[PDB]
Symmetry: D2
């Protein structure tokens, strides 16, 4: 299932629990950027997915503030869990930094992360 410890292609660590109420809760540790140790995450997932072979839709957010550092930014991952020989969560993400209005055009990075239960 979704609950577990996952790693993305850069070796970030995503520790998540899927609640029966559709909640995702856990911690995220980033292999990149202005980040140190674990950050709180929260999200949601479809707790009654289609039974037709489709993946399970989900998303979560990390705001990049913890007790050590504050990057004044937040990442949301939107994606789906794909059950499988090798279970995977395939996502695309948006990383918005707090900016002045003049710099808002350059506030948001986009990318795609794939997570499995094995570290690269």
């Amino acid at each position: 299932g979704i609950t577990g410890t996952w790693y993305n292609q850069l070796g970030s660590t995503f520790i998540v629990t899927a609640g029966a109420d559709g909640a995702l809760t856990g911690t995220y540790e980033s292999a990149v950027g202005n980040a140190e140790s674990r950050y709180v995450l929260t999200g949601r997932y479809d707790s009654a997915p289609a039974t037709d072979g489709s993946g399970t839709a989900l998303g979560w957010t990390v705001a990049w503030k913890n007790n050590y550092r504050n990057a004044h930014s937040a990442t949301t991952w939107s994606g789906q869990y794909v059950g499988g020989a090798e279970a995977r969560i395939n996502t695309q993400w948006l990383l918005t930094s707090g900016t002045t209005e003049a710099n808002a055009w350059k506030s948001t990075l986009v990318g795609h992360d794939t997570f499995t239960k094995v570290k690269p």
Copy 2:
């Protein structure tokens, strides 16, 4: 400045509480605001933003399942809160639907939402 009710450009409404712990909790719904249009939201925000005039980074997720409906999808909004005389939350979003692998190319919509404290 974030806690309360916000309205997007399209008719949607959300009500959120910004907790002291950096949490965002609430519900997302339609203009009409009927029970069947209401979904849990959860997210995170920067609870200690920069003091140089930058916005406040935040993000949240809604999975489009409630006790009545299930669209097998989830949206994440990633953006920033701008305070001042015309307060706004400016976002970009990713809506991922659960798909088969063959259809994963058409799984993810992208767009933008601007939220205000007053109705459009």
Copy 3:
């Protein structure tokens, strides 16, 4: 139609010609209007759109190199032209900068530009 001089919400100037073959050609520049901030663009558009009221899909690219400056980056805009008494081109864009592999996570900005034939 599409051929003409457009401006985005930030004052950039998009001078484009829509050819009979689906080609878009022209130049993209900044508000100041100077040679050093002017760049070549090329793209494509649907030369036979639907007749049901839908917009006309289009996209184009600017590589941020000209005879004076090189930012080692390129932007693509993807969107549609909406006809009527206020013609508009609504777009989302991706701006990729050349990076090392280690920095590829932070290579791509995303945003949205709306273009009209009037200045903002």
Copy 4:
């Protein structure tokens, strides 16, 4: 290193010439290799990239109209070319369909393609 034939990870091919003026021209074949599935592409690239291990920024567009078919849509790919023994073009894409204003929310898909010089 850009000019030539490239293959994505899902059975598409394209064929591009990278002109000394920074033009990309060519054809994109959504399948392999029937003419009903071939479309014009044009774009731009950084014709003077860094030789510091950074990728070469580029982008291109395909409008999904040819002599056989018309999906009333256009994709733009934004990315970077990475040279060497195992050369790649790493992209993120936006696929916008022409829509009515009421449907504009669901107009734009996002995703990622990775192209290699060898077939997958």
